[PDB]
C-alpha cells in the first residue's frame, strides 16, 4: 500500500502506482475487511486520476468487489459517474452527499484540487463543442461560473 502512497505522493507514474494498490488489495482479500475496503479507494481514485471513468464501474460490478459493498464504494461510483457525464455541477452534488468519507482522507484533500482542473476543462470542451462563433456570456451562463477567469481559462487552451 505505502509503496503506492509515496509513489503517488509525487504524481509521476500513476499506472505503476495503481499496480501497487492492486497487489495491496489482493493481499488484504478476505482476511482483513477494514484494510480491504479502504484499498478500493486508492485504486479507483487513481483510475479517475488515470482518466478512465468507465473502468471504475467495470471493476466494482465484478464479482470480486460485489462482495465488498459499502458506503465508500458508492462514494466512488458517483464521482466516476460525475466524471463520466463530464460536468462540473454533476461533480458538486457528488461531493456534498458523501462528504464525510470523500472529503475526509488526508490524501484525497490533496488530490481533489488537481482532479478539479481536469474536470473543469472536460465540461468546457463539451459545451463549446456543438457550434461555431458564440458569445462568452452564455458559456459563463451555462457553466454557472464567472467571465474573467473563464476567459483566462479559455486563453490557456489556445496557448
Amino acid at each position: 500500500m505505502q509503496s503506492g502512497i509515496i509513489h503517488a505522493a509525487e504524481e509521476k507514474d500513476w499506472k505503476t502506482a495503481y499496480s501497487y494498490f492492486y497487489e495491496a488489495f489482493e493481499g488484504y482479500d478476505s482476511i482483513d475487511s477494514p484494510k480491504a475496503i479502504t484499498s478500493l479507494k486508492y485504486m479507483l481514485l487513481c483510475k479517475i486520476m488515470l482518466n478512465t471513468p468507465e473502468d471504475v464501474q467495470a471493476l466494482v460490478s465484478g464479482k470480486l468487489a460485489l462482495r465488498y459493498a459499502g458506503r465508500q464504494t458508492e462514494a466512488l461510483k458517483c464521482v466516476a459517474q460525475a466524471s463520466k457525464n463530464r460536468s462540473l455541477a454533476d461533480f458538486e452534488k457528488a461531493l456534498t452527499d458523501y462528504r464525510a468519507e470523500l472529503r475526509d482522507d488526508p490524501i484525497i484533500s490533496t488530490h481533489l484540487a488537481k482532479l478539479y482542473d481536469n474536470l473543469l476543462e472536460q465540461n468546457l470542451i463539451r459545451v463549446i463543442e456543438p457550434f461555431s462563433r458564440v458569445q462568452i456570456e452564455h458559456i459563463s451562463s451555462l457553466i454557472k461560473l464567472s467571465k474573467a477567469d473563464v476567459e483566462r481559462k479559455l486563453s490557456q487552451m489556445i496557448l
Binding site: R126, V127, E129, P130, F131, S132, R133, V134, Q135, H138
Partner: peptide, 18 residues
C-alpha cells in the same frame, strides 16, 4: 435539444448564437 444530439454525433450540426 441540438446540444445532446451532436455530442451523441447522431446528427451533425454547426449552430450559431449571434
Amino acid at each position: 435539444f441540438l446540444s445532446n444530439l451532436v455530442v451523441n454525433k447522431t446528427i451533425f450540426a454547426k449552430v450559431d448564437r449571434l
